[PDB]
Amino acid sequence: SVVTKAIVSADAEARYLSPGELDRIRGFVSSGERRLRVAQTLTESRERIIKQAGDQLFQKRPDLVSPGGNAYGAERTASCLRDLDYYLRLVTFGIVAGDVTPIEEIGVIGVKEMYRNLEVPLPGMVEAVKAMKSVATGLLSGDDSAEVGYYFDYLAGALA
Amino acid sequence: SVVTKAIVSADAEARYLSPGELDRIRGFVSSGERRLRVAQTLTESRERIIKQAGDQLFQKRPDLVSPGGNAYGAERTASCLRDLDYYLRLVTFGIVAGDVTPIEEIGVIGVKEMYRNLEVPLPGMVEAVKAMKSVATGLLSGDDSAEVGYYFDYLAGALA
Amino acid sequence: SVVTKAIVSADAEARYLSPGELDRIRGFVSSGERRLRVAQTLTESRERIIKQAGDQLFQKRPDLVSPGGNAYGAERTASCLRDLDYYLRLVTFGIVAGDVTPIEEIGVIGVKEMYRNLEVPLPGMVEAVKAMKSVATGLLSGDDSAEVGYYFDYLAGALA
Amino acid sequence: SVVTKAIVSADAEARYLSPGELDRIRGFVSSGERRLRVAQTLTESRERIIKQAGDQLFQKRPDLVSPGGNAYGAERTASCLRDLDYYLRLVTFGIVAGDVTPIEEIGVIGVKEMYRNLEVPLPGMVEAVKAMKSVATGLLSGDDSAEVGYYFDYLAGALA
Amino acid sequence: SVVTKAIVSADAEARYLSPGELDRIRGFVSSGERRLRVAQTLTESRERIIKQAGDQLFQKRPDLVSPGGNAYGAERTASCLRDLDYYLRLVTFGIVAGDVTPIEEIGVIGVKEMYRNLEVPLPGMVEAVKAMKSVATGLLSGDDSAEVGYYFDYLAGALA
Amino acid sequence: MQDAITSVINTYDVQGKYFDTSAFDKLKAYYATGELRVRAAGTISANAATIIKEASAKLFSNQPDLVRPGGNAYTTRRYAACVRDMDYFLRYATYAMLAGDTSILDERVLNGLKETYNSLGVPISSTVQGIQAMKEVTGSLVGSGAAKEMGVYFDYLSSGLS
Amino acid sequence: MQDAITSVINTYDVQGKYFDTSAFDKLKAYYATGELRVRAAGTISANAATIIKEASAKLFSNQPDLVRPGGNAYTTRRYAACVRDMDYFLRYATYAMLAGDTSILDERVLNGLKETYNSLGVPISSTVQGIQAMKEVTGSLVGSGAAKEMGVYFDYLSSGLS
Amino acid sequence: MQDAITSVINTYDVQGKYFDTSAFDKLKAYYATGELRVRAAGTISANAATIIKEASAKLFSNQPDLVRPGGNAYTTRRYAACVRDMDYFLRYATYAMLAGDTSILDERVLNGLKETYNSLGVPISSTVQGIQAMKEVTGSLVGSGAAKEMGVYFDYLSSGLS
Amino acid sequence: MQDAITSVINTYDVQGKYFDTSAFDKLKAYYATGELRVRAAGTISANAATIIKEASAKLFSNQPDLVRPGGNAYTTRRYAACVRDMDYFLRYATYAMLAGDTSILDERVLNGLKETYNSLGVPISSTVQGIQAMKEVTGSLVGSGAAKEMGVYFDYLSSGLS
Amino acid sequence: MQDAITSVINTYDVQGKYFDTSAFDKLKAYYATGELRVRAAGTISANAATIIKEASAKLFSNQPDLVRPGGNAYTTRRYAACVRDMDYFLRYATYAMLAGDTSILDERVLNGLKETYNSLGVPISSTVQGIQAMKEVTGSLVGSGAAKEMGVYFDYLSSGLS
Amino acid sequence: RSGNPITNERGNPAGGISDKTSLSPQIFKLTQDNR
Ligand SMILES: CCC1=C(C)/C(=C/C2=NC(=C\c3[nH]c(/C=C4\NC(=O)[C@H](C)[C@H]4CC)c(C)c3CCC(=O)O)/C(CCC(=O)O)=C2C)NC1=O
Ligand SMILES: CCC1=C(C)/C(=C/C2=NC(=C\c3[nH]c(/C=C4\NC(=O)[C@H](C)[C@H]4CC)c(C)c3CCC(=O)O)/C(CCC(=O)O)=C2C)NC1=O
Ligand SMILES: CCC1=C(C)/C(=C/C2=NC(=C\c3[nH]c(/C=C4\NC(=O)[C@H](C)[C@H]4CC)c(C)c3CCC(=O)O)/C(CCC(=O)O)=C2C)NC1=O
Ligand SMILES: CCC1=C(C)/C(=C/C2=NC(=C\c3[nH]c(/C=C4\NC(=O)[C@H](C)[C@H]4CC)c(C)c3CCC(=O)O)/C(CCC(=O)O)=C2C)NC1=O
Ligand SMILES: CCC1=C(C)/C(=C/C2=NC(=C\c3[nH]c(/C=C4\NC(=O)[C@H](C)[C@H]4CC)c(C)c3CCC(=O)O)/C(CCC(=O)O)=C2C)NC1=O
Numbered sequence A, B, C, D, E: 001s002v003v004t005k006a007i008v009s010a011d012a013e014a015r016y017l018s019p020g021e022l023d024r025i026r027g028f029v030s031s032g033e034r035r036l037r038v039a040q041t042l043t044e045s046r047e048r049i050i051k052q053a054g055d056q057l058f059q060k061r062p063d064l065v066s067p068g069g070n071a072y073g074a075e076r077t078a079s080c081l082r083d084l085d086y087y088l089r090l091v092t093f094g095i096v097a098g099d100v101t102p103i104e105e106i107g108v109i110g111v112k113e114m115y116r117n118l119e120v121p122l123p124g125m126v127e128a129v130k131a132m133k134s135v136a137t138g139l140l141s142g143d144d145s146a147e148v149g150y151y152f153d154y155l156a157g158a159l160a
Numbered sequence F, G, H, I, J: 001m002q003d004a005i006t007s008v009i010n011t012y013d014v015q016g017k018y019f020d021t022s023a024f025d026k027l028k029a030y031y032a033t034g035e036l037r038v039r040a041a042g043t044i045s046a047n048a049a050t051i052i053k054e055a056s057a058k059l060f061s062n063q064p065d066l067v068r069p070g071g072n073a074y075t076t077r078r079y080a081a082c083v084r085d086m087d088y089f090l091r092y093a094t095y096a097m098l099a100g101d102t103s104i105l106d107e108r109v110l111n112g113l114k115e116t117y118n119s120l121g122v123p124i125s126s127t128v129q130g131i132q133a134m135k136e137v138t139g140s141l142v143g144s145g146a147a148k149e150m151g152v153y154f155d156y157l158s159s160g161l162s
Numbered sequence K: 001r002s003g004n005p006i007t008n009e010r011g012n013p014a015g016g017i018s019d020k021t022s023l024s025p026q027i028f029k030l031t032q033d034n035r
């Protein structure tokens, strides 16, 4: 979270929070309500986002579902869409937290080794996250989509 | 080579080579003719090995050549077979050297970030080197087939 | 032993054994039979080797058994012969092990401190080991003599 | 010298010489003439000290001059006596300087490896320098003999 | 103390004490008698030194005892003089120890944080220490005055 | 180190569930109290040195044997370490109050602290008394509500040590 | 570490004897098994990542709780940690197999692993299941003769954890 | 560490008193023995190798099984470790004699040494016999006055192990 | 480094000769000068701050551009470095004077000093002027007899920079 | 460092072509002398101490001025450096012989060695005589066939120095 | 801390580079010309 990150930065320097961290926390708690509304928007329509993003991903990379691909079969495609559900939930967690700390801790640390064991192509994950970002920015209105995109951007940069 | 590693290991401890190091060098140079004729057999079989290895690669992994894959198109398949030729040449170099060092300083050190730059799947690489192992060990004699297959094992493990 | 050194070398680098290490293990396992025959030959002739080596050493270095020498007296000469017996046993251990690892860990690490504590001259150790080398390889055939001479070489170089 | 050690310490913790160290240097320089008398007294008695020490050493260690011994022969015994002369001169240098740093820089740094290269027993060296102590201390008064015995003991410990 | 410093230095190198630092300990145990006499002189006249220095300081710094001053009041002036007594006792400890180490450990390390917590002005500390130095130096002999002033100047620089 | 928001995120992640009304209620409560938390944290940050000075004075007045010879706070270095420890307790109570969770207290303060003091010979009861001294000193500066809020963390430190 | 040849050498050293017929028989047994050991070691080195893949897939199929939310293997971090532990187990079991002794398993792996897992919260039962999964996966690859040799070392790891 | 001077300084600083007649008498007593202590330390430093030689020779004459196959000191490595430990004991006894206090033995040698030896399998009784051999050898070289002082630190080491 | 005594030691070691009358004459000369050297060294050590005071004042008075913005002395860290360099020069001149030989200055102060100052932009001439400032203040303070001796080392440093 | 095999690998990799008959013949030539090279290295391993001792004795008998006072070899430290240099030369000649390449000498031994000896005042001519002395002493023991292949590298070292 | 108590990084982030006291171990620095 923003508060946890500020506290950690202050502890690293063994000092109390200065006016900068304090008023950034005040801004963060002031804007918490609109963050909650944005998270509600993505939570209520999660299945739409997952299905649209899976469709766009398979359009861009049909080889994933093709014979010999990792997403070949109904079960493996279900696992793909379930991973997209995981990452959407993590993105909503990051939105409510105001930081990418939940995304990083739950789904970025060790993602390379995990998807290597599963033999999942990381680039395919990248287009999947980009499709999710396009859909989510489609649903959100104006500046809200902006910050949501940032989280998705980070996730893409995390996976590439 | 074997002599190179032995000399470096002896020099690190600032001491002359031990009877074990001398024994391994003696066994290496004693078997020079066998590994040399093995490398000759491998090098005289450029295109049969390359083409059959590519065929097994593409028929066990159809999605490399499928639209959207890494090897889709004629030029990308040509680059695939070119890399296969590279690794076959490296295997011959390692066989004559008596050690996997030439493969390491040429083809193993930095291969992961190389193929991550090229967006080349590493499971595809290990499948390709496995196919080349099968094709090459088919041609060689039973005693020499194991010697070839051990270096192919190192290459396959090194890729992924 | 050969297996132990190969495995610790692999483990220090967090890797499986390389093809060269596996080939070296194969060679050692193949030669184990002649290794055991040589070890039996040395073990059976231990008393003759010790007697002749002691006589030759004291003929080459009469100062050791001269008054004031470290080996003056029947008791100290007996202890000298007992040390020769230790080192012959260690040589047989090194032969069966395929490496000088048992010799090093049992009778080379800290031997200079031990002989400084005991007023035992290291050069005298060197001619004693050379005398055992001569007497023992006198009994063995040429191929056996070479391998046993390598271990007596290592021991003499370590004492020197 | 005492001045050199005080200066290198003061430079090490990086401040001017402490009043106690100035007292020490004054005590050293005020006693220089007595040290010069001691050095001259030792110099006048080179031959007696050296030859009596060598005789004592060869009485305790007849093997060193026995056939096969290190100092066997007139020339090798002469080299023995010349080494004793070297160390006596170094002891006089140290008495003049006020510490043992000349004895280190000229006679102790690398002495072990050198006498190993020459196959000279270090126990013989310590016996010889102890004999030189015994001879030289008697020549001097109690206060001066104590100081000289300090240097001889230090050299004996350094050799051992 | 000097003995402790020499032993720590010899221990850090895992070696016996060298003749130079043994000579240092010899000089220290020689000077012990006069240093005990100096310390006893300071101990006997402690009340006189404390009263004289307190009066001199309070005249030199009227603001400390004036209302709104740190030492204003009976109890706070008593605390001021009690701190002076601590530092006088520390200087006696340093004199007997032959170094400023007791002073450093007991009353120098962390002194600035302590007096910062106590709203005690450090320039007042420095002037009080200088006043005690003047008073003590006046009370004892000229030769020992330099030795005492060494510790007092160390304390003044540390508090500065 | 987890705050209230992170605690809710974790309790919803371990279940694999998306956020619902109850989670939004909890986060809204935290956002409501955030302004009080920030004001109290700023006040304590501005007056940290004064709080430490007052509390150390009160503790050493109530237990004068600490700073007298033979007490654990008798030397310049030990007095400095004592006020340094009081600075730790105040700063980490401020962190815990701002985060709204006592995880940082089990997490960065109280883990192995009893063993550390027992090895050093530091008095535990006297340290608890000093933590209270800081609590009463800080409550006056921060006001009634912020004092009620910081009291739970100071009492947490006291109970963990005791 | 210690292997079979060094084991014979060490026992005869402690006893201070030259080699007898029994020692040479033990050494001949090791030399007989060595070529099979080398073949199996090369096979496992070739297929290490594969073996880990099927073994982990089998374990997480038999115990789907681990990978699902609230499971010990549920995170990218925790999943990668599980795969890393399994890779360690496979590599050191291969070392023990090629050596012919389980001493390396005691020192490098088993001395401290139970307490580590108990402090971390790792389920030891599921870890033994993962080791058994690796055992039955690698048995089909190395061949029946090499499977028999590798099974004792996998059983050793499983018993050490249990 | 803490020597006799520092020991008196600490025992008087903890009380908060100045040096009285008894303290000054203790300091005089320590300073009186300074020449004897320095002379003994120089003698031991000069003859450390000889002392270890004779002490080890007597210890292995009384207990030959230590240096025979199956003994804790049977190898070149373990014999060297034995004589290294004996050298450490002699050096630290010399330090304690120079300081006139046994603190350095407790905080540089005896801190966890008994359990270190117990974990290693080192025979503690044989180590004590070696320390006694070192004491009786050193006493002859240093002289009776210095022998009496070296004895107390040798027995302190012995009681620390025992 | 080497002082006057070690110079004679080396001259007689290279020849291999024992000490003779000329050596004793040189040694007695140094011993006689030793008391003057010690007294001057103590005077410099006591007043070193004051010599720095006056020398820095005179140097910056002659060349005010350094302290002013754009000069090589313009900032607190860089001014502190400036005065610390003069402290270095005074301390090492004192060391060389007390030793009696200039070898220490070559080994430590002037070993790559000119190149380092040129790279850092330090003006050699201005530092030299500071050197004569310290030299003249020292000559005033310690008396003409010790002034003549200290001048040798000061002009040695000046020419080393030059 | 690179031997003959690594050299041909470098050439054929920068050229980018597989091995041809000429390079196969070159590898045959290397493998032919591998046995002799291993045997010579094994012989030199034992006699390294003896070869160095005899070479030092001959060099210092031919040139006693080096060890007499005023010579470059005159001290324990400088005699140490001399015999250490000869040890290094013998070892690196053995390394180059077993590798079959002289590049290892250039990378470590001969990289500015002349300039360093001239800087330290070491006589190049006497170093050449020492290398040559090691040459005949080694050749007397290795055997004429090994003597030639060792003397080629010894001559290379001498010519590099001179 | 094996040394000055108030040099711990938790309280004092710059305590690592702080001046050593008599409470700290021996510090060995190689200032010999670094040629
Ligand atoms: C001697 C060591 C060495 C290696 C191995 C090496 C590999 C290599 N492969 C390349 C391209 C390529 N290589 C491949 C091969 C992949 N296609 C399939 O997925 C397979 C799994 C796999 C081959 C078996 C492909 C598809 C490309 C084209 C990628 C692109 O369009 O950028 C390139 C870029 C140069 C070019 O495009 O011509 C390099 C440098 N280079 C070296 O110096
Ligand atoms: C200033 C420092 C210094 C020292 C100490 C020194 C010693 C020294 N002794 C030498 C020879 C020797 N030194 C000795 C003396 C040993 N024989 C034993 O019995 C005794 C225990 C012992 C003497 C007490 C002997 C016998 C030789 C002849 C060795 C030989 O030529 O084979 C040599 C080789 C040159 C020669 O043969 O003349 C050196 C360099 N050189 C130095 O530059
Ligand atoms: C042995 C090492 C040691 C020292 C040095 C030490 C100093 C010390 N001085 C104290 C009080 C004090 N100390 C002073 C001294 C100041 N008054 C003026 O400003 C002067 C500039 C200056 C003295 C020359 C004063 C005024 C107080 C009372 C503070 C108060 O009660 O508010 C206290 C608070 C505890 C008490 O009063 O018993 C300490 C710990 N404690 C130690 O354990
Ligand atoms: C934030 C988590 C944390 C805590 C709490 C902590 C406490 C702590 N206090 C210490 C020393 C100390 N602490 C105290 C404080 C006590 N003495 C008085 O009696 C008081 C009653 C009481 C304080 C109110 C003292 C006197 C010392 C010095 C002990 C010594 O140096 O031997 C030390 C050892 C020195 C060091 O390296 O800092 C620690 C680790 N450290 C931590 O990382
Ligand atoms: C909360 C954080 C988190 C994540 C993200 C996560 C990923 C994850 N992906 C998995 C499998 C999978 N993941 C995918 C997805 C791939 N399909 C295509 O190739 C694409 C490139 C790509 C998606 C865009 C597929 C197909 C599988 C099935 C692989 C198999 O069955 O072997 C599994 C194994 C499921 C099981 O064993 O029951 C996990 C745990 N785990 C976590 O704890």
Ligand SMILES: CCC1=C(C)/C(=C/C2=NC(=C\c3[nH]c(/C=C4\NC(=O)[C@H](C)[C@H]4CC)c(C)c3CCC(=O)O)/C(CCC(=O)O)=C2C)NC1=O
Pocket (backbone or CB within 6 Å): C064, C070, C071, C076, C077, C079, C080, C081, C083, C084, C086, C087, C106, C107, C114, C118, C120, C121, C123, C124, C125, C128, H060, H064, H067, H068, H073, H074, H075, H076, H079
């Ligand atoms: C397996 C590893 C190992 C070794 C090698 C070893 C050697 C060893 N030799 C010893 C005695 C001895 N060793 C010798 C041998 C010397 N005599 C001549 O000088 C020769 C140059 C030389 C032998 C070739 C002598 C003379 C003694 C008797 C020493 C004495 O009586 O004081 C001792 C003292 C204990 C005892 O006598 O039982 C040891 C520990 N110990 C070990 O644990």
Ligand SMILES: CCC1=C(C)/C(=C/C2=NC(=C\c3[nH]c(/C=C4\NC(=O)[C@H](C)[C@H]4CC)c(C)c3CCC(=O)O)/C(CCC(=O)O)=C2C)NC1=O
Pocket (backbone or CB within 6 Å): J066, J072, J073, J077, J078, J079, J081, J082, J083, J085, J086, J088, J108, J109, J113, J116, J120, J122, J123, J124, J126, J127, J130
């Ligand atoms: C592993 C690669 C390597 C090489 C090749 C090597 C040679 C070498 N010898 C050196 C010094 C030296 N070399 C010698 C040897 C000379 N004494 C004379 O009598 C003889 C003519 C001659 C030898 C035969 C001496 C005496 C020194 C020290 C000179 C001094 O300290 O001033 C130095 C300078 C380092 C020093 O100050 O000690 C090098 C680099 N060192 C290496 O690390």
